[PDB]
Design an enzyme around this catalytic site. Structure first.
Site, PDB file in Angstrom:
ATOM      1  N   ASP A  19      69.336   8.022  33.545  1.00 14.71           N
ATOM      2  CA  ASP A  19      68.022   8.415  33.262  1.00 14.71           C
ATOM      3  C   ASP A  19      67.315   7.934  31.834  1.00 14.71           C
ATOM      4  OD1 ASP A  19      65.676   9.573  34.112  1.00 14.71           O
ATOM      5  OD2 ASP A  19      66.483  11.820  33.088  1.00 14.71           O
TER       6      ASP A  19
ATOM      7  N   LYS B 246      65.142   6.165  29.485  1.00  8.63           N
ATOM      8  CA  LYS B 246      63.877   6.096  29.118  1.00  8.63           C
ATOM      9  C   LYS B 246      63.381   6.484  27.855  1.00  8.63           C
ATOM     10  CE  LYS B 246      62.542  10.239  31.566  1.00  8.63           C
ATOM     11  NZ  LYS B 246      61.885  10.493  32.788  1.00  8.63           N
TER      12      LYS B 246
ATOM     13  N   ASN C 182      63.598  10.317  26.947  1.00 12.81           N
ATOM     14  CA  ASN C 182      64.687  10.911  26.628  1.00 12.81           C
ATOM     15  C   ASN C 182      65.548  10.632  25.401  1.00 12.81           C
ATOM     16  OD1 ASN C 182      64.292  12.511  29.120  1.00 12.81           O
ATOM     17  ND2 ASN C 182      65.584  11.131  30.358  1.00 12.81           N
TER      18      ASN C 182
ATOM     19  N   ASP D 260      69.300  14.741  27.910  1.00  9.55           N
ATOM     20  CA  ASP D 260      68.898  14.744  29.547  1.00  9.55           C
ATOM     21  C   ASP D 260      69.908  14.058  30.329  1.00  9.55           C
ATOM     22  OD1 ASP D 260      68.228  15.023  32.121  1.00  9.55           O
ATOM     23  OD2 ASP D 260      65.935  15.024  31.489  1.00  9.55           O
TER      24      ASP D 260
ATOM     25  N   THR E 111      63.262   7.101  37.170  1.00  8.73           N
ATOM     26  CA  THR E 111      61.951   7.296  36.840  1.00  8.73           C
ATOM     27  C   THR E 111      61.707   5.830  37.502  1.00  8.73           C
ATOM     28  OG1 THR E 111      62.267   8.335  34.922  1.00  8.73           O
ATOM     29  CG2 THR E 111      60.521   6.936  34.931  1.00  8.73           C
TER      30      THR E 111
HETATM   31  N1  LIG Z   1      67.863  18.646  21.643  1.00  3.87           N
HETATM   32  C1  LIG Z   1      66.557  18.699  21.807  1.00  3.87           C
HETATM   33  N2  LIG Z   1      65.732  18.645  20.883  1.00  3.87           N
HETATM   34  C2  LIG Z   1      64.304  18.436  21.241  1.00  3.87           C
HETATM   35  C3  LIG Z   1      63.736  18.327  22.408  1.00  3.87           C
HETATM   36  C4  LIG Z   1      64.619  18.324  23.599  1.00  3.87           C
HETATM   37  C5  LIG Z   1      64.405  18.152  24.899  1.00  3.87           C
HETATM   38  S1  LIG Z   1      62.608  18.292  25.307  1.00  3.87           S
HETATM   39  O1  LIG Z   1      62.649  18.368  26.707  1.00  3.87           O
HETATM   40  O2  LIG Z   1      61.666  19.118  24.269  1.00  3.87           O
HETATM   41  N3  LIG Z   1      62.028  16.758  24.895  1.00  3.87           N
HETATM   42  C6  LIG Z   1      60.809  16.598  24.747  1.00  3.87           C
HETATM   43  C7  LIG Z   1      59.674  16.940  25.840  1.00  3.87           C
HETATM   44  C8  LIG Z   1      60.346  16.617  27.258  1.00  3.87           C
HETATM   45  N4  LIG Z   1      60.839  15.268  27.132  1.00  3.87           N
HETATM   46  C9  LIG Z   1      62.444  15.040  26.942  1.00  3.87           C
HETATM   47  C10 LIG Z   1      62.797  15.394  25.326  1.00  3.87           C
HETATM   48  C11 LIG Z   1      65.202  18.109  25.838  1.00  3.87           C
HETATM   49  C12 LIG Z   1      66.393  18.069  25.581  1.00  3.87           C
HETATM   50  C13 LIG Z   1      67.076  18.221  24.478  1.00  3.87           C
HETATM   51  C14 LIG Z   1      66.245  18.604  23.305  1.00  3.87           C
END
Ligand SMILES: Nc1nccc2c(S(=O)(=O)N3CCCNCC3)cccc12
Length: 338
Positions: free
Chosen positions: A154, A156, A159, A172, A189
């Site tokens: 994944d 990109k 992430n 992710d 993706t």
């Molecule tokens: N440790 C993290 N700290 C901030 C944000 C985190 C996110 S999250 O979905 O908020 N993010 C932003 C919106 C969707 N795209 C993927 C990354 C996902 C997984 C872990 C996170």
């Protein structure tokens, strides 16, 4: 030998946690909800604060019934089992996990600097040194993951989060999988899919190296190499064996990218006899001190602007929806191991 012994110890430590995963290490009412950070078809990620310690975390919440419907059971079990077992400077830390009647929860360290994607779109493109700093972290992370028989699947910019020191945290692991040999699932993706995924082949870690090529191109150009309005048109470009480079790309960058974006997986860098060293030793990386990157001693291209560990200004705004928990258990059998 130094790398050999490092990776041997890394695999030993991973396998011990992989064989005996942690479970049920917090509960929902240990946290206060702050803000929704992201949202998808079967879950969302929320900034939360632990009520006793005051620490902030990113809590990924997956709806069990939606995971079942979208045929993501094995994937969500993979994600948690892997995340609780890995340990590397550029992999997000899972601090707690648990489940309830309705949802699965993965509570990670909150990375406050935002997605790489946001920064890339705000500045247009990254210079080659800037792209190279991030790329080197991905190279080392894939060296680590692949040595554990893990494929990531994944990669990109959305992430990859930027931390307080300007370094990458990979998030992710929903498509990450422990694979000895080949695997077959169609996932990823569109812009980042390797040709062998599109063509429904049994594929291996080479797909991660292809995705690194896509990422480096997107970081350095500002847009990915294969794009179109409809996925089918993207896939036609991916499988064609043709790619065009902006004239501002260095010759070294173009050469590395032709070898990562090699449609024939048996000729792709990262999948040859020399493995990752064909990449680490390429001239585009000649200025990279791999050990200094691993030790986080290189000054980053930029530090994100943020006020404190609870600042959400580098993330965007989503409708704030309930975290409802059913009074009856859903899908208990399917998620027993979580
Ligand atoms: N440790 C993290 N700290 C901030 C944000 C985190 C996110 S999250 O979905 O908020 N993010 C932003 C919106 C969707 N795209 C993927 C990354 C996902 C997984 C872990 C996170």
């Amino acid at each position: 030998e130094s790398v050999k012994e490092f990776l041997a110890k890394a695999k030993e430590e991973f396998l011990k946690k992989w064989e005996s995963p942690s479970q049920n290490t917090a509960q929902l009412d240990h946290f206060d909800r702050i803000k929704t950070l992201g949202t998808g078809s079967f879950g969302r990620v929320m900034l939360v604060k632990h009520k006793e310690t005051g620490n902030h975390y990113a809590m990924k919440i997956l709806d069990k019934q939606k995971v079942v419907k979208l045929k993501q059971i094995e994937h969500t079990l993979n994600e948690k089992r892997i995340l609780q077992a890995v340990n590397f400077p550029f992999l997000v830390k899972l601090e707690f996990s648990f489940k309830d009647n309705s949802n699965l929860y993965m509570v990670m360290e909150y990375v406050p600097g935002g997605e790489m994607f946001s920064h890339l779109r705000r500045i247009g493109r990254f210079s080659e040194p800037h792209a190279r700093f991030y790329a080197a972290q991905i190279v080392l992370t894939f060296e680590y993951l692949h040595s554990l028989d893990l494929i990531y699947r994944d990669l990109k910019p959305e992430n990859l989060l930027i931390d307080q020191q300007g370094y990458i945290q990979v998030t992710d692991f929903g498509f990450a999988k422990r694979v000895k040999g080949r695997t077959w699932t169609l996932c990823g993706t569109p812009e980042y899919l390797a040709p062998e995924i599109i063509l429904s082949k049994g594929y291996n870690k080479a797909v991660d190296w292809w995705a690194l090529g896509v990422l480096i191109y997107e970081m350095a150009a500002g847009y990915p190499p294969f794009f179109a309005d409809q996925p089918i048109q993207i896939y036609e470009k991916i499988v064609s064996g043709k790619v065009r480079f902006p004239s501002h790309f260095s010759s070294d960058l173009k050469d590395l990218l032709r070898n990562l974006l090699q449609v024939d997986l048996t000729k792709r860098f990262g999948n040859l006899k020399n493995g990752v060293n064909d990449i680490k030793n390429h001239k585009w990386f000649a200025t990279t001190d791999w050990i200094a990157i691993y030790q986080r001693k290189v000054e980053a291209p930029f530090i994100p602007k943020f006020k404190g560990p609870g600042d959400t200004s580098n993330f965007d705004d989503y409708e704030e929806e309930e975290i409802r928990v059913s009074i009856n258990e859903k899908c208990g059998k399917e998620f027993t191991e979580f």
